[PDB]
């Protein structure tokens, strides 16, 4: 897609292996927020949003949390609380044309900044401060979307970069995406480490009478510490006790 009307995909219910990405390194730039690209390979996620578009190679700077500028302001904002990763690479080899590749478009201006993660497909003339022109171009009355017109005789910063931004969430839902790590038997008594769908901790695991309702992936103490989990393979509610611990 154009970064105007950028595409979105609900990547889910599958096994990822981001090592194939992080280690491929063919793309020029790769950045992450809220995770390292290495540790990323060993987590599970409730959902993943993959969005992709094309922008000028300098504009990649704006595709980050809290940036400002026409791309972030009018094409793809990112929330300050964002988590995910941005990747981009020079794609001049595929996206330029001898005469400008006017297929791609970007909204040059808008009545206000976009929502931090919203999409805007409208194409009304951006009204002037003058009386409305009702679809007539004129004084400040402009068609809202400009074309980059990518062509090869163009500076690297201005060369087209196609971009994929992955974003994901960590809700109360079960994970639907996880890394390639294997899984063990459950040593259901000894003090052990555990990693249930990425929930990382240590304790004595045990059976429980907690009688979770079917939607309940976790249970918590009055302290709001985690206290039980359903074993995602057994679907059985196991209680978690902290290991033997005290002053000597």
């Amino acid at each position, epitope marked *: 897609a154009s970064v105007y009307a950028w595409n979105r995909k609900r990547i889910s219910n599958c096994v990822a292996d981001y090592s194939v990405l992080y280690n491929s390194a063919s793309f020029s730039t790769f950045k992450c927020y809220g995770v390292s690209p290495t540790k990323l390979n060993d987590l599970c996620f409730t959902n993943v949003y993959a969005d992709s578009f094309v922008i000028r190679g300098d504009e990649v700077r704006q595709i980050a949390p809290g940036q400002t500028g026409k791309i972030a302001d009018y094409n793809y904002k990112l929330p300050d609380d964002f988590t995910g990763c941005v990747i981009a690479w020079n794609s*001049n*080899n*595929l*996206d*330029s*044309k*001898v*005469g*400008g*590749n006017y*297929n791609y478009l970007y909204r040059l201006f808008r009545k206000s900044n976009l929502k931090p993660f919203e999409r805007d497909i409208s194409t009304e003339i951006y009204q002037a401060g003058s009386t409305p022109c009702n679809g007539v171009e004129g004084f400040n009355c402009y068609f809202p979307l400009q074309s980059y017109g990518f*062509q*090869p*005789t*163009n*500076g*690297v910063g201005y060369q087209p970069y196609r971009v994929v931004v992955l974003s994901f969430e960590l809700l109360h839902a079960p994970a639907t995406v996880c890394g390639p790590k294997k899984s063990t038997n459950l040593v259901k008594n000894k003090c052990v480490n555990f990693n249930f769908n990425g929930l990382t901790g240590t304790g004595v695991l045990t059976e429980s009478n907690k009688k979770f309702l079917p939607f309940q992936q976790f249970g918590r103490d009055i302290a709001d510490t985690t206290d039980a989990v359903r074993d995602p393979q057994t679907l059985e509610i196991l209680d978690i006790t902290p290991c033997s611990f005290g002053g000597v």
Partner: antibody
Framework: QITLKESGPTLVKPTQTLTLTCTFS??????????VGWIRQPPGKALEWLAL???????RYSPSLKSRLTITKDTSKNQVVLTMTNMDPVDTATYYC???????????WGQGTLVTVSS | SALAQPASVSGSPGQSITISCTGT?????????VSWYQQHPGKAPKLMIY???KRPSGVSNRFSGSKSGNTASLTISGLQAEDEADYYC?????????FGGGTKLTVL
């Protein structure tokens, strides 16, 4: 293998419009980022790019001759049909159709066809 | 043409040879994708350098190249009589794709 092949009448009177069909194989012109263009070479002078068509039905022509050049294709026949009106005798030259990518500005070239403008 | 070349250059076997190419700043910019084509008389040019020093599959390993600013340069290591052919630099311009004036190599 990937190849291109020029075809059409090599002799055209100047009043008529030359039509040339380049036939290709080993790829589909619908492939993203692929294009096919034309190059001609009169005897002993440098080469001149004429026209280029991209997979996405997008057309380009040399502005010095864009008025006269008209290019067309039929992906179902794996053919690019070029046409240019009002042949000047000076247009008599060898003509080439070639496979194009941005990275490989003209990777593979057809055999080329002679073109002559006279009686 | 917006791209110019020496009409001819001379070398001898086992020596290096260079054919320069000159762009036109007003429509070459980064002067990227500057290719070089060999053309023996009566044959279709064959791409041999696409990006500077970058060689397409079926590379004749002796062929090589370089660039310096607005000046491109083809380099052939260990000349041989088979090199004697036309050489054309070519690069994109925002108005159009263009070819250099060619160079008539002589391989003494």
């Amino acid at each position: 293998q990937i190849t291109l092949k020029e075809s059409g009448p090599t002799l055209v009177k100047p009043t008529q419009t030359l039509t040339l069909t380049c036939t290709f194989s080993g790829f589909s012109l619908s492939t993203s980022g692929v294009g096919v263009g034309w190059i001609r070479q009169p005897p002993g002078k440098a080469l001149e790019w004429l026209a280029l068509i991209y997979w996405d039905d997008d057309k380009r022509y040399s502005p010095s001759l864009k008025s006269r050049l008209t290019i067309t294709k039929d992906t179902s026949k794996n053919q690019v049909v070029l046409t240019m009106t009002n042949m000047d005798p000076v247009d008599t030259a060898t003509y080439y159709c070639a496979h194009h990518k941005i990275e490989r500005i003209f990777d593979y070239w057809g055999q080329g066809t002679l073109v002559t403008v006279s009686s | 043409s917006a791209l110019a070349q020496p009409a001819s250059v001379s070398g001898s076997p086992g020596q290096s040879i260079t054919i320069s190419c000159t762009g036109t700043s007003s429509d070459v910019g980064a002067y990227n994708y500057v290719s070089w084509y060999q053309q023996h008389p009566g044959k279709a040019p064959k791409l041999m350098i696409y990006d500077v020093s970058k060689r397409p599959s079926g590379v004749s390993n002796r062929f090589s190249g370089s660039k310096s600013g607005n000046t491109a340069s083809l380099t052939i290591s260990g000349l041989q009589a088979e090199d004697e052919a036309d050489y054309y630099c070519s690069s994109y311009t925002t108005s159009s794709t263009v070819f250099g004036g060619g160079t008539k190599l002589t391989v003494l």
